[PDB]
Design an enzyme around this catalytic site. Structure first.
Site, mmCIF file in Angstrom:
data_model
loop_
_atom_site.group_PDB
_atom_site.id
_atom_site.type_symbol
_atom_site.label_atom_id
_atom_site.label_comp_id
_atom_site.label_asym_id
_atom_site.label_seq_id
_atom_site.Cartn_x
_atom_site.Cartn_y
_atom_site.Cartn_z
ATOM 1 N N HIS A 165 0.805 -1.224 0.000
ATOM 2 C CA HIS A 165 0.000 0.000 0.000
ATOM 3 C C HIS A 165 0.842 1.280 0.000
ATOM 4 O O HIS A 165 0.264 2.361 -0.088
ATOM 5 C CB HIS A 165 -1.075 0.041 1.097
ATOM 6 C CG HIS A 165 -0.583 0.115 2.516
ATOM 7 N ND1 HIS A 165 -0.101 1.296 3.061
ATOM 8 C CD2 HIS A 165 -0.631 -0.825 3.489
ATOM 9 C CE1 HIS A 165 0.159 1.023 4.330
ATOM 10 N NE2 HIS A 165 -0.141 -0.242 4.632
ATOM 11 N N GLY A 215 2.366 6.028 10.385
ATOM 12 C CA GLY A 215 3.768 5.927 9.991
ATOM 13 C C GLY A 215 4.464 4.669 10.494
ATOM 14 O O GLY A 215 5.626 4.427 10.163
ATOM 15 N N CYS A 271 3.503 1.548 9.718
ATOM 16 C CA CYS A 271 3.374 0.494 8.693
ATOM 17 C C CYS A 271 4.737 0.008 8.221
ATOM 18 O O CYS A 271 5.641 0.824 8.032
ATOM 19 C CB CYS A 271 2.517 0.955 7.517
ATOM 20 S SG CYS A 271 0.936 1.717 7.988
#
Ligand code: QZU
Ligand code: CL
Lengths: 298, 302
Positions: A41, A136, A138
């Site tokens: 993503h 942030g 991820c």
């Protein structure tokens, strides 16, 4: 003495954390050899269509204060694999492993390719993790260490509306019935990891706490009927076998400890605590108890 | 979202852990630049620990009596000196993995990460707090002496604790990195006992503000309290007195959530009176006191 929620030493994983930026999205990547792994993503989404429009230079990868140049890219399930020109000199010995619910692991939470903290957690039976993450985070990873080999088991992808977390193994396969898309998703009803609570009860006995022990035993079937009433996971013969060493060390048979657990579920703690806790802890596996009560090093 | 007991990443400290052996005793050392720091009781026997005269035991030692191991490499000891309860072994090699560091002495209520080691090898990392009675509720076994506590703010490691002993109640005692013990403890096997422990009030309030930040307000009430009336109630539950400094330190969290410190104090008074009634706060059935105001701002707000 003492019993803490302990994480593995994170150094071998800190040396692999990089920052990955594509357009306006910035998240964390795992740099192993000449490949950087990160959630796809970073690029209702059609990821083959989004990826085909990208060139290598669209991905900015930063390792400390050094920019790495992307020389290739490919997608494996929900993970993006960025081929870089430089192999990571700090690459440890590693494996990619998929864990089962009830298993535990350490998480190195990162922001902008910089590690900020380490914590221990468990894969819940509903396939979510009760982690501590902010925007942030991820691309932050979950791991275990066995001898000198880092087994990467989790990559963080998203937060669910209840505040819990969902992610994939390092081959991009989600744990649980989730998708990497902004859509109405919810965690299933969670259950308590029974084999883990029993292991933590054995850890309390090893540390000198025996108030919850009783003279009684139970059959596995009678215990499973009672545990199903209290949203506890069913205890199998494999779980009973895995608790063998702890049962032999303390002289308390697994079904004897199960009878203590039945009494705690039916009657509560009555103002008392077990290992400084008023709740029954389920995020220590039988192996975590043996390792912490023996001093295994890495 | 979420709220976990989080430790600092341990890599900067792992690269400093060494094994120190003197005679039959083996424990952990901290190798920073060309010096290895370790508990001075590494020079003792079990028949020495009741009343050891460290100056007399040390004067009988030569450099080559201390074996220092960094991984699979033996380091050569070229000098030795004692500073309070810490032995400082000068070695012939500066640690190439030495991070940016400071030695800091912390106060009770402050938190830190512990890298538990055995035979110079790190086995685990956990988050801990210096209790008001100067002990730490750690997870230590025989051979863990010399394990260190630290905080990593920015790229700098602040070493604040070195493990020396386990007390009869299962709690731990140690020193700062200059060898001064926290508490009235001594590195003697003499009858020592931790003082009565108390709850770190400013930390419970900080954790209550963390619960409000994460969307939990069930415990709040329409009351306020004076600081004195709060302390008269808190002392009855074995809570540490809350000072004006603590109230000032909670200012940022009070401004962020809109709940005045003395209004949060009134909610704490009511929690102490009523218990939780089957409810939890941040996944806990007890009032948590091992997160400082600073830890809450760091974790909940980034
Ligand atoms: C030669 C010396 C020596 O081995 N000393 C260590 C010792 C100690 O507390 N060790 C331990 C630390 N941590 C955890 C433990 C768990 C279980 C057993 C021992 C643990 C043991 C004896 O009592 C004392 C008394 C004073 C001092 Cl400073 C140190 C010690
Ligand atoms: Cl301090």
């Amino acid at each position: 003495s003492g019993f803490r929620k302990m994480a593995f030493p994170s150094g071998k994983v800190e040396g692999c954390m990089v920052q990955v930026t594509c357009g306006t999205t910035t998240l964390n990547g795992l740099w192993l050899d000449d490949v950087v792994y990160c959630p796809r993503h970073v690029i209702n989404p059609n990821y083959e269509d989004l990826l085909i429009r990208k060139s290598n230079h669209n991905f900015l990868v930063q390792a400390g204060n050094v920019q790495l140049r992307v020389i290739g890219h490919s997608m494996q399930n929900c993970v993006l694999k960025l081929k870089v020109d430089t192999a990571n000199p700090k690459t440890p010995k590693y494996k990619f492993v998929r864990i089962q619910p009830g298993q535990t692991f350490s998480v190195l939470a990162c922001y902008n390719g910089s590690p900020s903290g380490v914590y221990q957690c468990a894969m819940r039976p509903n396939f979510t993790i009760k982690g501590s993450f902010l925007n942030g985070s991820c691309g932050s990873v979950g791991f275990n260490i066995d001898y000198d080999c880092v087994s990467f088991c989790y990559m963080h992808h998203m937060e669910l509306p209840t505040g819990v977390h969902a992610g994939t193994d390092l081959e991009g396969n989600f744990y649980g019935p989730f998708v990497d898309r902004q859509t109405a998703q919810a965690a299933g009803t969670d259950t308590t990891i029974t084999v883990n609570v029993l292991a933590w009860l054995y850890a309390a006995v090893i540390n000198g706490d025996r108030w919850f022990l009783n003279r009684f035993t139970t059959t596995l079937n009678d215990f499973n009927l009672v545990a199903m009433k209290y949203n506890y996971e069913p205890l199998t013969q494999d779980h009973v076998d895995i608790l063998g060493p702890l049962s032999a060390q303390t002289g308390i048979a697994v079904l004897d400890m199960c009878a203590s657990l039945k009494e705690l579920l039916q009657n509560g703690m009555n103002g008392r605590t077990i290992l400084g806790s008023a709740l029954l802890e389920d995020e220590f596996t039988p192996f975590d108890v043996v390792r912490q009560c023996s001093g295994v090093t890495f």
